Amino acid sequence: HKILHRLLQ
Amino acid sequence: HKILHRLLQ
Amino acid sequence: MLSDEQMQIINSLVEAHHKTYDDSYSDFVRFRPPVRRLSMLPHLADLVSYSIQKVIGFAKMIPGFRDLTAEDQIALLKSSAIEIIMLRSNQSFSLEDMSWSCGGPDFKYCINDVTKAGHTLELLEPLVKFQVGLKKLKLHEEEHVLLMAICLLSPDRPGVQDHVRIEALQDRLCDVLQAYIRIQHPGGRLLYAKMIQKLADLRSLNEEHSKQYRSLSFQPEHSMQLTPLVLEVFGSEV
Amino acid sequence: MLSDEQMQIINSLVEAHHKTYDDSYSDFVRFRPPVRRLSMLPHLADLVSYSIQKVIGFAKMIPGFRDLTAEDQIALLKSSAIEIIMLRSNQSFSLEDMSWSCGGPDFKYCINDVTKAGHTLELLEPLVKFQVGLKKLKLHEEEHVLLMAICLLSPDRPGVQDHVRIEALQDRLCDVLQAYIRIQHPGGRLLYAKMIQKLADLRSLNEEHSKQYRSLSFQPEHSMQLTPLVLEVFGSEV
Numbered sequence A, B: 001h002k003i004l005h006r007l008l009q
Numbered sequence C, D: 001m002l003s004d005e006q007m008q009i010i011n012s013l014v015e016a017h018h019k020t021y022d023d024s025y026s027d028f029v030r031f032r033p034p035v036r037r038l039s040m041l042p043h044l045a046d047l048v049s050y051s052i053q054k055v056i057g058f059a060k061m062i063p064g065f066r067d068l069t070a071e072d073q074i075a076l077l078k079s080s081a082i083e084i085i086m087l088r089s090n091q092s093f094s095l096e097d098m099s100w101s102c103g104g105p106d107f108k109y110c111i112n113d114v115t116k117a118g119h120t121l122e123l124l125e126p127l128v129k130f131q132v133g134l135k136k137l138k139l140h141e142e143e144h145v146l147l148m149a150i151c152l153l154s155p156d157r158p159g160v161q162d163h164v165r166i167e168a169l170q171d172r173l174c175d176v177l178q179a180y181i182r183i184q185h186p187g188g189r190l191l192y193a194k195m196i197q198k199l200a201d202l203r204s205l206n207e208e209h210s211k212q213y214r215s216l217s218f219q220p221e222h223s224m225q226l227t228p229l230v231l232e233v234f235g236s237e238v
């Protein structure tokens, strides 16, 4: 979940 | 390489 | 009458919604254009991808969500994503033409468009029925925002770990909604129940989408049209 | 003078190129629009993704490529992909404005556009220099098609297994090119060598792109803008 982690700061 | 396989028939 | 904490919770949610929903749909020109096999899939994928980002932005501001583990934030975001998208889309849904109107001739979306996007009437028929049901509730901006935040903090989702802290945040928001309708919504005597029942509908709608998505995602010629975010949000990775 | 087999090889390649390159760039309206941080990345990703599909279509028709293992076809496609894209793009490259002109105001691509797409002058300066060098060779449609097929069948790539059968197909195509320039290209006395040297340039260009792509792909906010095909073609999976 690389994208989801970045997006959640 | 799922996409590449499909595309190569 | 409503308390300061209950009021601050409404304010932040309403502000979060305002920051993450554009009523001009001006960003829609940036997506792969709609085309009228599966001609509407590129546009739908771009549209759904854009909306996931907006749901994350909104989520980050739901009081208490930022305090959960990254694991629980992802668990809740993944499982509720499509339901929030269905909820938020009601704002563009119109009873006059039974469509999501987001712009000119191009962004006026009827149910036949979603057929050309890899989904069937089995998902679309209850979706339109749910859209009409929800609109008819003539929700206040506060009720609509709260229902999205209630939906997002449902403990009963696959992957959730702290289903006692999530249930807590959800009950705190449920109390906010229940009090808002009593104190601030005339003729709202039945609304809260009607709203809670819309959450049950969303689980059926969510289920049908998941099946239809697995079918679409299993075909590389179709999954290649999706976006890395859509792929990650709706994918099975644990 | 050229033999029937050598002639049939040229015909199929020229026909394959014709089937996989549109001189009207009419499909460019289907991509995420160009915008002038990394505003040009969505369009570039859509453009590169579209071109990979076209390179696969062309490849499938290179005589002998279809007979290789799926593993070797993928190995060669992955490692040569960017070089074929660089080769094929020469057709839209213009000496008059030092740009790839693919349409109206929108699809006229200068080097500053690729800067707004996550790449640096370190890749772009030798690319433009290579583009001008290649154009100046005033290649025949047959030479350009053959050079792409030579590039694609290079045995010296990471992942290749049958580097004796690939070297064989490449030499057979090299003989076709060498004979074509002698028999059919007046003043081509030095061209073949000049063409072979463009393959060495492409390895440097390929190398620089790989580094710049790893930098872009390592940042989730940037990799989310790519397409599943781009991600898979340029990714490290074995």
Ligand SMILES: C=C1/C(=C\C=C(/CCCCCCC)c2cccc(CCCCCC(C)(C)O)c2)C[C@@H](O)C[C@@H]1O
Residues within 6 Å of the ligand: C040, C041, C043, C044, C045, C047, C048, C051, C082, C085, C086, C088, C089, C090, C091, C092, C093, C100, C102, C109, C113, C114, C116, C117, C119, C209, C213, C216, C230, C234
């Ligand atoms: C996404 C939004 C809008 C409309 C939403 C809508 C209606 C969309 C109609 C437009 C269709 C274009 C082809 C919709 C909502 C939920 C489910 C569905 C159907 C399945 C979508 C999932 C796709 C996926 C992941 C590839 O399986 C459509 C439009 C605005 O209200 C903004 C809002 O965020």
Ligand SMILES: C=C1/C(=C\C=C(/CCCCCCC)c2cccc(CCCCCC(C)(C)O)c2)C[C@@H](O)C[C@@H]1O
Residues within 6 Å of the ligand: D040, D041, D043, D044, D045, D047, D048, D051, D082, D085, D086, D088, D089, D090, D091, D092, D093, D100, D102, D109, D113, D114, D116, D117, D119, D209, D213, D216, D230, D234
């Ligand atoms: C792709 C094509 C065209 C232009 C190509 C070009 C010139 C493109 C100029 C347009 C730039 C738009 C932002 C180009 C070629 C090779 C490398 C590069 C730079 C790096 C691209 C890789 C991107 C990636 C995978 C995200 O790292 C550009 C345009 C036509 O000639 C068709 C042809 O297939």
